[PDB]
Amino acid sequence: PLEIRELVIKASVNEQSAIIAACVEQVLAILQEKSER
Amino acid sequence: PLEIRELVIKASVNEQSAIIAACVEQVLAILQEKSER
Amino acid sequence: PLEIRELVIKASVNEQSAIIAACVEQVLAILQEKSER
Amino acid sequence: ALTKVKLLAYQDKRFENKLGEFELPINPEQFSQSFKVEYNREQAQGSQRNDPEFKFTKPEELKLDFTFDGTGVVPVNNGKPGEFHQDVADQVRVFLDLVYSMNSETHKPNFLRLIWGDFSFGEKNGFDCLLTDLQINYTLFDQTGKPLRAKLSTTFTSYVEQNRRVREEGKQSPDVTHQRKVKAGDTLPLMTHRIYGDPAYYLQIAKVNGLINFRKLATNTDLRFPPLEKTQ
Amino acid sequence: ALTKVKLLAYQDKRFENKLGEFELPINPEQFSQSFKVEYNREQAQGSQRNDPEFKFTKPEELKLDFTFDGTGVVPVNNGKPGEFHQDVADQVRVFLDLVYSMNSETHKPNFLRLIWGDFSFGEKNGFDCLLTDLQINYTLFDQTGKPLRAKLSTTFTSYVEQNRRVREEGKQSPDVTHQRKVKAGDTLPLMTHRIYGDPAYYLQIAKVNGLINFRKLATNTDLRFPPLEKTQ
Amino acid sequence: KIQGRVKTKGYPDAKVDVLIQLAGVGDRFNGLAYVSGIRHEIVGGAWDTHIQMGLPPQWFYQEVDIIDKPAAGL
Amino acid sequence: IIPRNSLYDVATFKLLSDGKDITNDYTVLSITVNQIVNRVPTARIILRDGAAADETFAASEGADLVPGQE
Amino acid sequence: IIPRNSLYDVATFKLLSDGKDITNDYTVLSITVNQIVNRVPTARIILRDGAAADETFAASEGADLVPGQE
């Protein structure tokens, strides 16, 4: 993302972190685009 | 979804595409329902 | 979540349910926090 | 005398209303039992080793294999001369009806108890369980199509009721009342530490028992240790 | 007389309209059958062991292997002297047409029933099924290209209709009416507990049957136990 | 005009409201960039930083509700 | 939490539609019910249906699950 | 980026609460800090806690991590 507050916070210490990040850029792009004329 | 602008865009060409789609219908249903009285 | 209407509805009967729940608390926390000054 | 394995079928979840029993025609050669405990394994940063926390104990697992044979070379243990086992289908039928099919009054399979004579699993003489896995192999047939040998493999899981589970865990904590006798060498703060884990409560204990001087105790006094308040 | 395995092909889901049958030229040496039950295995935190809840029973599975051979050394079981099996392609063709291809009137493959003489799977003499897996290996050929031996491996799954499934589960519950005769040693609260699971209903039962004194029962009385109301 | 985000390893001397030089990305993005924000993350012993460049184009009053409702919501 | 005097722990449910019990006439997969303060109660029901060989939805064409029923 | 005259590259941190260093008194899992222009600085701290056998949260009951402290 182009923002730092839209990054996912990491809470675990013992080891799929690159799928909870791809499934977050997709939702924010589906949701932002929904606001333009 | 019942809309075409709520579909997830596919950007890869070499091969879990059916989990980034189920985790997007769930969020939109949790979020829409949050707006009705 | 602290709410009952923010819980994901379960529709299947034959068997990854703990990844569609972690990828939903992350989006709602990224989205709520985006509204405070 | 040779003893045989028995499977008892019950309808009640307290194991009081017996429905039936099945006896094996040939004892198994061996069986296996499995145990496991679950801990929390999160670790702090740049730390050498760890001290895991307890989460829970899982139900035990049991594995068994046995055989039905009807070609007329295995004797029947009833004392009659000239008798050998010759009917596989009847045994398969009664076994499946007892351990597998749905009960018409409870809408689920029956509760099982496994017993082998003088065998002991632990502190008990039986295994209370439910069937989870079963496989049958038919390897020999008659000229009319009826089977002459069957091999069975089964997996069972452990079952125990709520009311009984909380009674087996006789949890003793500062949630109950204690009583202790004073013997040679005892002091009040050390007894308080040995019951509560903290000596600081000693001044309260002396007040509960009416002790004027609590630094010189007599050696036949019985002291009461009340529980702690539920929320502080 | 030697009996052979038969596969019956039906069009109706109630298994009434028979379309055809296929008979194996060589019986299989063995086959296998598989069963399974599903439970809920969630546990409370800090608890020793558990008491799982029942979810459902899954359909059974069946595995079979057999062979077609046409080199002229396996006799044909028809009583004629000098006859041996010599045509593999015809058998493969009729088999695939019967069990695999789509039906032009139903738009799907046919329903199958497996029968072997006097064999019994359980409480029935046949297996009602659908084909899910098949593999063929051709290992010997003629100088013109036509095959002389084929080996087949098949996997079938169990099939049973809705209407019939709910009738096989003859669910008996406090949803129906019961009738009981009074015999020596019976008391009303104990009978009520044995039918409803709760003695507290006894005062209602006495009113349904017109009992003035319900602490001294006669020993030929037939009592009716009505069902419970659907929602409370 | 141009907005962006960069992730690198732990950088103790990171500060906002300064300039950095961005290179190696073609003629159309090279040059001096203005830092708007910083995030530090330390998870399980690892340390990395994120540097955000550029500002958003919307006004402050267009993103938040800073006026009450009519009739005071009664 | 488990009611006292339960001899078996099999959980059961019942779905009535205009007074008629239709639990065992269809294949029911899931049920969810929400009761929250200051909101309207809600329920969601998921059934299995559809068959490509028959080219129809049989329970959809019935008269028990159409909008407007109790 | 790595500071000059670093003999080892072990990364360290320190968490003070009302002037007292409490880094090695608890089990720290993660720390995140955000400094953005036109916004209020933020930090989030994740510690390991809880034990079902003891039926309490020991660091929650302490006096170092309660709302209102520096």
- Is it the case that chain A and chain B have 3 or more CB pairs lying under 8 Å apart? yes
CA neighbor of E119 nearest in space, from E3, E18, E1:
E3
* Beta-bridge partner residues of E40: E53
F4 touching A, CB under 8 A?
yes
Residues of D in contact with E46 (CB under 8 A): 54-56
Chain F residues in contact with H35 by the CB 8 A cut-off are: 16, 37-39
- Looking at the partner chain, which of C7, C19, C27 has a beta carbon nearest the beta carbon of B27? C27
Across chain A, how many H-helices and E-strands are there? 1, 0
Contact G15, E232 (CB under 8 A): no
A/E Cβ contact: 3+ pairs below 8 Å: no
Length, in residues, of chain H: 70
- Whether A21 and chain C come into contact, CB under 8 Å, resolves to no
Paired tokens of D9: 């079928």
Residues 2 to 61 of G: which have CB under 8 A from any D CB?
A: 2, 7-10
Residue whose token pair is 């709410």? C3
> Which CA distances in Å does E12 have to E20, E22, E120, G53, G59?
12, 18, 23, 14, 21
A13 in contact with D, Cβ within 8 Å: yes
Please list every residue in chain B followed by a chain break, i.e. its C lies more than 2.5 Å from the next written N.
Answer: 15
How long, in residues, is chain G? Answer: 70
Experimentally, the structure was elucidated by: cryo-EM
Angle at the Cα of D207 (from D204 to D212), degrees rounded to 5? 125
Interface residue D107 vs chain G (CB under 8 A): yes
CB contacts of A22 in chain B (<8 Å) are 20
Instruction: Burial-class residue D110 by CB neighbours within 10 Å (0-12, 13-18, 19+).
Output: buried
Torsion over CA: F12, F16, F17, F21 (sign): positive
d(CA D51, CA D73): 60
Q: Which tokens in the block code for residue D95? A: 């076994």
Q: Which residue of H has its CA nearest to D169?
A: H53
| Buried-exposed string C4-18: b where 16+ CB fall within 10 A, e elsewhere | eeeebeeeeeeeeee
Q: At what angle do helices B22-32 and A22-32 cross, to 10 degrees?
A: 50
DSSP G51: B
Torsion-angle region of residue D49: left (phi > 0), alpha (psi -120 to 50) or beta? left
CA distance F55 to F39: 16
Nearest to D132 by CA among D158, D102, D106: D158
Beta carbons within 10 angstroms of residue D37's beta carbon: 10
H14 DSSP β-pair partners: none
- Per the CB < 8 Å rule, is B24 touching A23? yes
Parallel, antiparallel or unpaired: strands D6-10 and D18-23:
antiparallel
Q: Report CA dihedral (E69, E71, E72, E76) to the nearest 10 degrees.
A: 10
The radius of gyration of chain E's CA atoms, rounded to the nearest angstrom, is 29
- How many whole angstroms separate alpha carbon E132 and alpha carbon E109? 11
Which chains border H (3 or more CB–CB pairs < 8 Å)? Answer: A, D, E, F
Report the alpha-carbon distance of residue D231 to residue D195 in Å, rounded: 19
Among the listed residues E175, E204, E177, E180, the one whose alpha carbon sits nearest the alpha carbon of residue E191: E180
* Helix axes E202-209 and E188-196, enclosed angle (nearest 10): 110
User: What single-letter amino acid sits at E173?
Assistant: S
Q: What CA–CA distance (Å, rounded) separates E4 from E8?
A: 13
Six-digit token string for G26: 């269809």
Distance from the E197 Cα atom to the nearest Cα atom in chain G, whole angstroms: 6
> Where do the DSSP E strands lie in chain D?
6-10, 18-23, 31-34, 37-40, 53-57, 61-69, 111-115, 127-141, 147-158, 178-181, 222-225
- Strand, coil or helix: what is C17? coil
H51/D54 CB distance under 8 A: yes
Question: Which residues 1-37 in chain A show a CB within 8 A of chain H?
Answer: 4-5, 9-13
Interface of chain D toward chain A, CB-CB under 8 angstroms: 41-43, 45
The single-letter code of the amino acid at D38 is E
Residue type at position D40: N
Q: How far apart are CA F62 and CA D80, in angstroms?
A: 99
Kindly tell me whether chain A and chain F come into contact, counting contact as 3+ Cβ pairs under 8 Å.
yes
Residue whose entry in the numeric block shows the structure tokens 């049920």: G31
Number of residues that this document lists for chain D = 232
Tokens of G45: 């029901």
Size of interface C-G (CB pairs under 8 A): 14
Which of H27, H50, H51 lies closest to D44 in CB terms?
H27
Please choose, from the candidates A10, D141, D109, the residue with its C-alpha nearest in 3D space to the C-alpha of residue E4: D141
Number of H helices, E strands in chain E: 4, 10
Candidates B27, B9, B28, B29; CA nearest to B17 is B9
CA distance readout (Å), D96 to D142, E121, E123, E189: 22, 10, 9, 35
List C-alpha distances in Å: H9 to D6, F39, F45, H4, H24.
Answer: 67, 20, 11, 11, 20
Q: What is the DSSP code (8-state) at residue E82?
A: T
CB D26, CB D73: distance < 8 Å: no
| Among E67, E101, E73, CA closest to E85 | E73
CA distance F39 to H32: 7
Helix residue ranges per DSSP H, chain D: 88-99, 162-168, 188-196, 202-209
Measure the N-to-C terminal CA separation of chain A; round to a whole number of Å. 22
Interface mutation target, options H10, H48, H60, H61, chain D, most CBs of D under 10 Å: H48
The residue of chain D with its CA nearest to that of G6 is: D13
Residues of H with Cβ-Cβ distance to F11 under 8 angstroms: 1
Asked whether the beta carbons of E95 and E47 are under 8 A apart, the reply is no
Residue H26, min C-alpha distance to chain F (Å)? 14
- Residues from chain A that touch F38, judged by Cβ atoms under 8 A, are 4
The span from the CA of D10 to the CA of D24, in Å, is 18
Q: How far apart are CA E178 and CA E195, in angstroms?
A: 8
State yes or no: chains D and F have 3 or more CB pairs below 8 A.
yes
N residues, chain F: 74
Neighbouring-strand partners of residue D128: D113
CA-CA distance, E196 to E180, in Å (whole number)?
13
Helical spans, DSSP H, in chain E? 88-99, 162-168, 188-196, 202-209
